[PDB]
Design an enzyme around this catalytic site. Structure first.
Site, PDB file in Angstrom:
ATOM      1  N   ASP A 179      11.437  13.336  34.009  1.00  0.00           N
ATOM      2  CA  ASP A 179      10.783  12.172  32.986  1.00  0.00           C
ATOM      3  C   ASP A 179       9.998  11.066  33.909  1.00  0.00           C
ATOM      4  OD1 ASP A 179      10.153  10.763  30.608  1.00  0.00           O
ATOM      5  OD2 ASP A 179      12.256  10.415  30.092  1.00  0.00           O
TER       6      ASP A 179
ATOM      7  N   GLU B 287       4.802   7.205  35.294  1.00  0.00           N
ATOM      8  CA  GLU B 287       3.555   6.381  35.125  1.00  0.00           C
ATOM      9  C   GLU B 287       4.033   5.193  35.774  1.00  0.00           C
ATOM     10  OE1 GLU B 287       5.113   9.041  31.818  1.00  0.00           O
ATOM     11  OE2 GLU B 287       5.807   7.379  32.810  1.00  0.00           O
TER      12      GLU B 287
ATOM     13  N   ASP C  49       7.139  10.560  23.565  1.00  0.00           N
ATOM     14  CA  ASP C  49       8.022   9.679  22.836  1.00  0.00           C
ATOM     15  C   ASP C  49       7.379   9.228  21.298  1.00  0.00           C
ATOM     16  OD1 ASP C  49       9.788  10.032  24.744  1.00  0.00           O
ATOM     17  OD2 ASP C  49       9.524   7.735  25.247  1.00  0.00           O
TER      18      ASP C  49
END
Ligand SMILES: [Ca+2]
Ligand SMILES: [Cl-]
Ligand SMILES: [Cl-]
Ligand SMILES: [Mg+2]
Ligand SMILES: [Mg+2]
Length: 1059
Positions: A533, A536, A598
């Protein structure tokens, strides 16, 4: 007390820190403002700027009070405007009452302006590259533009504004015609026309058709420079007609057609409102146009694609640079045999998708709330009790939440000097008393497990021995990136994992260390990959990596270096390991699955997820997943859950997930919890139907996964990728192609049951019931909440793993090592061919071919050598005989007899499918169905006017027949295809007329004729009448009316079209 100014802040694209320089990179004629802070707020503070212009000391510029906030005062200093070439160096200073001075800097900027290509002054053809020597509109450079061919249909442009850099060689298969006014470069696939004065390029296909061209007024190609020290941006501008559509640009949530928008190639972690903000975790500087070309800007720097967003007929790109005058602009114009071939050529440049094991294509189960062994055991028991044969399992809340490589509650002696742990170093307690045993239990259920990870070392300011030891080691070893001053780079404080230290994935030693810490999870615990995950997380222009690159260039690349590093590591130990990630740029496709991130449990979010998958697909990211029905927000409604389930089962990767860490009641998006939360028990059978159907289609789905890896063809595709010339397909975002043959039309609107489906020209058959739908229009399809319209294209050959029941939606389990009944569903139309990837039997490619010859009442199937018994399911009328290698095989009267037989045939009257069983043989077998016609058009599936249907007289085909067709104003209409091209045909009308002779009036595309349907002995007796008709290309409207001069009642079973 202090003072602070930092011109670029965190270099964020969307926001500014309150102490930046504006503009960040000043151009000629722009007023430059410096924002400075001091603290604490107090009287008598003076703030000023000491500076030089081209080395000449200037008078100090005094800052003026702007506003106070918190403990600080903010000030603005105005340096004024500058001219191109001006070099400005400044230091900001603050002091109170002439006391101690605090300062920031020195900082330097070079003032720029745009210079563009003017004319081509000479052409040099080096055989494997062409140099265009040019003049510029301003400045003293001697630019050179290099043309080369990555392949005969893929053109590469490399611009050196100073002319000091040289382009790369490409293929030598091109010819040049050079004249005083124009140069034309030709290959067997492209014709590139270049006017010399002014310079302007047009890219055409070999036959002359225009693909795209530079903007009409020329001077299109340019660079932003001070003329001496820096090149900060590049641009090119192109002409675009009003109807041109632009697809891809990575994963986009707002729209699948970016015309009218400024598209930023910038990775970002935006929670829940990606569509509204037009942000994304996965950004790629590549687009595909329905005008039959792609464009790829080969750079990791941020770029902006202006797609007819400023001028109605212009698109442009603006590419950033770090100032280095030696970095050439490098981009490609990509043609190909078709749109999918364009994507293939793009993957030749940036990397092919890596084929994943078949287990990745089954259902994945996940929930953040699973944080102990008993949650795993209960999840496995719930799946078993509800007959959910999933294949993937994810744990997020598994670790100590400090190091992220140690199981929660485990005890051990801490290690120094970056040493790695082995399984036996741990005492396992509390929530996880035996991780290896838990993994074995997951494997025993036929599932594979992945563990959640991030690329950052957490630093929350708390004391935690092992993490503190690792941090000190990582910093002193040089394993982090550098902030620009020699200190380790940390994620900005306000962000996710703020203060954390990023692992520098460009540093091979750093990566080896980081992965060494997780080694025992693969070698001893036995896991099957990682959910990598984040990523960024790179901000700051001065952030510096071991490869010498800095923050501007590395922000978009970092997540892909991270993801690929882990993917390659896991696979080095476990060949079957799979990564599951969210962020990346060009090349992400090489390293596993990507999920859409998400999002909330709403229909609007569902709509956005589908746009994300369709745009990712065009961009070469094929193995794409989403959290079905949303991972957060209020629990999905039963309606949303069901609609989401159906699309999810027909998407590249099927996966449920939930955000909450410790909710009550459970937030699992599992089907059993969905039943529990909504009170709707029907959710379970509906979910089972879609899961079982996906497993029935797994042989087809996995072959499509292989075709992605081999040929660049994405699994799920926006309609224009297969039908670029079809104007109706351009903006569709609520249907798609799945594999080569299936048109899927999910319902993504709340409360909708009348689903519009655009059908391209050609015949489409409803895979669930055999309904025929000639293409060339938008049809309406009634889809209740449990129904998903799915259609197979003409000529499709679809491999399936079926039970002895032989219907879609029947549970075959999750055995990936064998088939139950390997079956091929066939919709015969002309000559078709399919290469099946038989992974069960060594991954051999099995070439199946079908030759339809309904004019002679035959369909032939050429089956290659197979390791297993095979069953064909051919859409047709009932054969008079069936031969294999010229020998008749026996007709089975029932499905039971068919199952007991070793070879034979059986006709399913409900589905209009001929089943043919052929034994496993080491040689090709020739199957021939004799006396067959195109499958019937069932009356009960037609458009009905004032009549109903029934099934109360035996012997009908399909599900029944039209009943009570016995009064004026009643009608049955069929949408019919000419079988073997426009021609005269015989239409066989099957009916019953128990009381007396009947007549009806028939209109074929508006042309009238009357027919007589003789009395049948009774209502249990069917008859057929032959009617001559003329059928044309496309959909034929065939209407049976009862007019004033007609008579009598009939039951109407179907019509068959034959020679
Ligand atoms: Ca019927
Ligand atoms: Cl020349
Ligand atoms: Cl009959
Ligand atoms: Mg190619
Ligand atoms: Mg293993």
């Amino acid at each position: 007390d202090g003072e602070y100014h930092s011109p670029y802040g965190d270099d964020d694209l969307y926001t500014v820190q309150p102490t930046e320089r504006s503009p960040r990179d000043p151009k000629a004629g722009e007023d430059v403002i410096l924002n400075i802070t001091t603290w604490p707020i107090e009287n008598g503070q003076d703030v000023w700027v000491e500076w030089t212009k081209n080395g000449v000391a200037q008078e100090n510029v005094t800052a003026a009070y702007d506003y106070n906030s918190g403990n600080n005062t903010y000030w603005k200093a105005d340096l004024g405007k500058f001219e191109k070439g001006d070099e400005i160096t400044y230091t900001t200073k603050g002091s109170t009452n002439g006391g101690t001075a605090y300062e920031s800097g020195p900082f330097t900027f070079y003032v720029t302006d745009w210079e563009y290509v003017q004319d081509v002054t000479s052409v040099v053809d080096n055989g494997d590259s062409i140099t265009l020597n040019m003049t510029a509109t301003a400045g003293d450079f001697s630019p050179k533009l290099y043309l080369s061919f990555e392949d005969l249909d893929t053109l590469r442009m490399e611009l050196s504004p100073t002319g000091k850099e040289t382009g790369h060689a490409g293929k030598s298969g091109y010819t040049v015609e050079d004249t005083a006014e124009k140069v034309t470069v030709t290959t067997e696939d492209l014709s590139i026309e270049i006017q010399k004065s002014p310079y302007r390029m047009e890219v055409h296909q070999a036959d002359g058709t225009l693909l795209t061209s530079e903007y009409t007024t020329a001077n299109s190609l340019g660079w932003l420079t001070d003329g001496k020290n820096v090149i900060n941006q590049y641009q090119n501008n192109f002409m675009t007609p009003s109807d041109e559509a632009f697809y891809g640009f990575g994963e986009r949530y707002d729209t699948i057609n970016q015309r009218g928008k400024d598209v930023e190639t910038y990775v970002y972690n935006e929670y829940q409102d990606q569509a509204q903000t037009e942000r994304t975790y996965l950004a790629v500087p590549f687009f595909v146009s329905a005008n039959k070309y792609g464009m790829y800007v080969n750079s990791d720097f941020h770029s902006q694609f202006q797609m007819a967003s400023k001028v109605e007929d212009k698109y442009s790109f603006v590419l950033d640079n770090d100032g280095d005058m030696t970095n050439m602009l490098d981009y490609y114009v990509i043609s190909g045999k078709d749109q999918n071939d364009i994507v293939n050529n793009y993957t030749d440049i940036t990397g092919k998708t890596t084929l994943l094991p078949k287990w990745a294509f089954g259902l994945w189960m996940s929930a953040n709330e699973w944080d102990r062994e008993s949650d795993v055991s209960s999840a496995l028991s719930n799946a078993k009790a509800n007959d959910i044969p999933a294949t993937g399992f994810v744990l997020e809340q598994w670790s100590d939440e400090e190091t992220y490589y140690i199981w929660n509650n485990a005890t051990y002696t801490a290690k120094k000097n970056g040493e790695a742990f082995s399984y036996d170093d741990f005492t396992f307690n509390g929530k996880w008393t035996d991780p290896k045993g838990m993994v074995d239990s997951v494997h025993d259920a036929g599932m594979n497990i992945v563990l959640w990870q991030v690329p950052v070392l957490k630093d929350d300011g708390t004391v935690y021995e092992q993490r503190d030891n690792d941090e000190e080691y990582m910093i002193s070893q040089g394993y982090s990136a550098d902030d620009g001053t020699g200190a380790p780079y940390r994620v900005p404080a306000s962000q996710w994992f703020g203060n954390g230290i990023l692992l520098d994935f460009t540093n091979k030693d750093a990566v080896d260390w980081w992965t060494s810490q997780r080694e025992y999870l693969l070698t001893e615990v036995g896991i099957d990959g990682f959910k990598t995950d984040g990523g960024e997380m790179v901000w700051g222009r001065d952030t510096t990596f071991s490869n010498g690159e800095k923050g501007q260039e590395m922000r978009n690349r970092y997540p892909t270096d991270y993801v690929s590093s882990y993917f390659d590591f896991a696979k080095s130990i476990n060949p079957e390991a799979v990564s599951f990630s969210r962020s990346g740029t060009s090349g992400a496709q090489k390293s596993g699955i990507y999920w859409s991130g998400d999002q909330t449990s709403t229909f609007d979010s569902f709509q956005a997820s589908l746009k994300a998958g369709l745009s990712a697909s065009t961009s070469g990211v094929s193995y794409w997943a989403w959290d079905m029905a949303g991972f957060t927000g209020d629990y999905p409604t039963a309606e949303l859950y069901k609609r989401a389930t159906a699309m999810a089962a027909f998407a590249p990767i099927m996966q449920f997930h939930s955000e909450k860490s410790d909710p009550s009641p459970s937030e699992e998006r599992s089907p059993w919890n969905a039943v529990a939360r909504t009170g709707d028990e029907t959710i379970l059978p509906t979910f089972q139907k879609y899961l079982y159907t996906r497993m029935n289609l797994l042989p087809y789905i996995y072959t499509a996964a292989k075709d992605t890896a081999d040929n660049g063809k994405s699994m799920m595709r926006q309609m224009a990728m297969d039908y670029p010339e079809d104007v109706n397909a351009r903006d569709l975002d609520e249907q798609y192609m799945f594999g080569d043959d299936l048109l899927v039309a999910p319902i993504v609107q709340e409360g909708q049951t009348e689903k519009e489906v655009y059908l391209p020209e050609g015949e489409w058959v409803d895979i669930w019931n055999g309904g025929v739908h000639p293409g060339g229009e938008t049809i309406s399809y009634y889809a209740d909440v449990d129904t998903l319209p799915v259609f197979a294209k003409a000529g499709a050959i679809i491999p399936m793993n079926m039970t002895d029941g032989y219907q879609l939606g029947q549970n075959v389990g999750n055995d990936l090592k064998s088939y139950d009944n390997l079956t091929f569903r066939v919709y015969p139309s002309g000559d078709s061919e399919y290469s099946f990837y038989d992974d069960v039997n060594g991954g051999e490619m099995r070439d199946i071919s079908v030759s339809e010859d309904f004019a002679n009442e035959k369909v032939s199937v050429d089956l290659p050598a197979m390791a297993d018994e095979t069953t064909m399911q051919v859409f047709s009328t009932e054969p008079t005989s069936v031969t294999i290698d010229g020998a008749d095989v026996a007709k089975a009267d029932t499905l039971d007899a068919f199952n007991e037989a070793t070879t034979g045939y059986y006709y399913d009257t409900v589905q209009n499918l001929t089943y043919v069983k052929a034994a496993a043989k080491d040689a090709k077998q020739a199957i021939v169905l004799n006396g067959v016609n195109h499958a019937p058009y069932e009356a009960e599936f037609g458009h009905l006017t004032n009549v109903t249907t029934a099934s109360d007289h035996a012997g009908y085909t399909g599900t029944g027949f039209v009943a009570g067709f016995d009064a004026e104003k009643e009608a049955v209409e069929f949408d019919i295809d000419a079988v073997d091209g426009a021609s005269d045909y015989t239409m066989e009308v099957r009916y019953s007329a128990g009381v007396e002779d009947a007549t009806r009036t028939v209109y074929i595309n508006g042309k009238k004729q009357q027919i007589t349907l003789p009395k049948t002995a009774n209502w249990d007796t069917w008859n057929t009448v032959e009617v001559p008709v003329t059928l044309q290309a496309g959909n034929n409207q065939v209407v049976f009316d009862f007019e004033a001069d007609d008579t009598a009642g009939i039951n109407f079973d179907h019509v068959v079209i034959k020679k």
